[PDB]
Curated annotation (Swiss-Prot), chain A:
Designated name of the protein: NADH dehydrogenase [ubiquinone] 1 alpha subcomplex subunit 8
Positions occupied by motif Cx9C motif 1: 35-45
Domain notes per entry: Contains four C-X9-C motifs that are predicted to form a helix-coil-helix structure, permitting the formation of intramolecular disulfide bonds.
Species: Bos taurus (Bovine)
Function per UniProt: Accessory subunit of the mitochondrial membrane respiratory chain NADH dehydrogenase (Complex I), that is believed not to be involved in catalysis. Complex I functions in the transfer of electrons from NADH to the respiratory chain. The immediate electron acceptor for the enzyme is believed to be ubiquinone.
Subunit comment: Complex I is composed of 45 different subunits.
Subcellular location: Mitochondrion inner membrane; Mitochondrion intermembrane space; Mitochondrion
Parent-record interval covered: 2 to 58 of 172
Source organism, top-level taxon: Eukaryota
UniProtKB/Swiss-Prot annotation, chain B:
Protein name: NADH dehydrogenase [ubiquinone] 1 beta subcomplex subunit 5, mitochondrial
Lineage, uppermost ranks: Eukaryota, Metazoa, Chordata, Craniata, Vertebrata
Cell compartments where the protein resides: Mitochondrion inner membrane
Self-association and partners: Complex I is composed of 45 different subunits.
Functional note: Accessory subunit of the mitochondrial membrane respiratory chain NADH dehydrogenase (Complex I), that is believed not to be involved in catalysis. Complex I functions in the transfer of electrons from NADH to the respiratory chain. The immediate electron acceptor for the enzyme is believed to be ubiquinone.
Length: 57, 63
């Protein structure tokens, strides 16, 4: 067996959405309408690639 | 019965019995090869049918 290839800690850094679940809950309906496109692109990648390393961008 | 009839009736008997004897020996060899290699209709033991698999998108992606 080979080596499990992993992204570097620097590839995994992004500004986080550090708000509590009640805040996400309150905005979820409008968030679903506004951010649908990048959200649905990312979910398509995940169910197609079946690999978290392949959808980081 | 005349000698010719018995004689040629004997050859007909011998042809049938020799063909049967050869087939009996060939079946034994075919059975030996099919049992050892599994590439024939005999000794074909079942495996799980792949049509029972669900290929729909699942609740989680990695699968």
């Amino acid at each position: 067996p080979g080596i499990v290839e992993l992204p570097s800690l620097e590839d995994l850094k992004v500004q986080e959405v550090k708000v509590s679940s009640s805040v996400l809950k309150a905005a979820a309906h409008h968030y679903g309408a506004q951010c649908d496109k990048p959200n649905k692109e990312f979910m398509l990648c995940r169910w197609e690639e079946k690999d978290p390393r392949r959808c980081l961008e | 019965d005349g000698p010719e009839k018995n004689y040629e009736r004997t050859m007909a008997i011998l042809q049938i019995e020799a063909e049967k004897a050869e087939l009996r020996l060939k079946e034994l060899e075919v059975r030996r090869l099919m049992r050892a290699r599994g590439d024939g209709p005999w000794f074909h033991y079942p495996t799980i049918d792949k049509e029972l698999i669900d290929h729909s998108p699942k609740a989680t992606p990695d699968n």
